[PDB]
Amino acid sequence: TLHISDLILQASPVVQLVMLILLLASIFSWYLIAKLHMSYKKARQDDEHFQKMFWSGAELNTLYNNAQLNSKRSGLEDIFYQGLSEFFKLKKRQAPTSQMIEGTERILRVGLSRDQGSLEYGLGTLASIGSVAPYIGLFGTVWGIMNAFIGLAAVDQVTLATVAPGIAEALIATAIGLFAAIPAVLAFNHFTAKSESVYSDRALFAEEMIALLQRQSVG
């Protein structure tokens, strides 16, 4: 006649605090998963849109004008526009093509690093939560068992009916810790895989852009 809620509402203060921290960590992790999933979906959609717009065969300058007229550009549009704008910044001056190519590479690397840093917002937070939730839950379990045994060690001969439901309260600490750690680990692995995929795609596009610029610039 015992419920999980009946275990949660009454316990020692320490394990209750531990379970509260684990619940808050789980809620925070779910919020971060939702937000970062939305961000990755938007980034992927913008990436594919830009690839189809670029390799359509339209003039490179016309793509620059399209970037200029757009204000909401964030992804491959934005980094592409920075790169090409800096490239024409050196066409309007006089300089050899080699160091212009190096500068375009530098600005593309800066852009990729900036957008990737702003894109993986709280991935390290998920890493930390998934790494320490089981440890906090296990500490709660250890403290609950310790409190149960110290409270019931000299009161005559204790019966299973007197020690079992405090062991239950100790165990629920690590149960909640694993429940708050499963989403964190899953989302961290999946989302770092997606981050690697997106960054690889962006780097390959940057290399192809340098190839096209070099080929058209040498003449």
Binding site: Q116, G130, L138, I145, V158, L160, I167, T192, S200
Partner: protein
């Protein structure tokens, strides 16, 4: 030649699976002499 992928610095820890198992062993070795049929 280099493969294009960036390394990540944050790493995750192994699950304290053995620690929880030894906690369960402690619970069972303390509960065992309390049961009587």
């Amino acid at each position: 030649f280099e493969r294009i992928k960036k390394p990540l610095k944050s790493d995750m820890n192994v699950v304290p699976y053995i620690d929880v198992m030894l906690v369960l062993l402690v619970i069972f070795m303390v509960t065992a002499p309390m049961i009587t049929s």
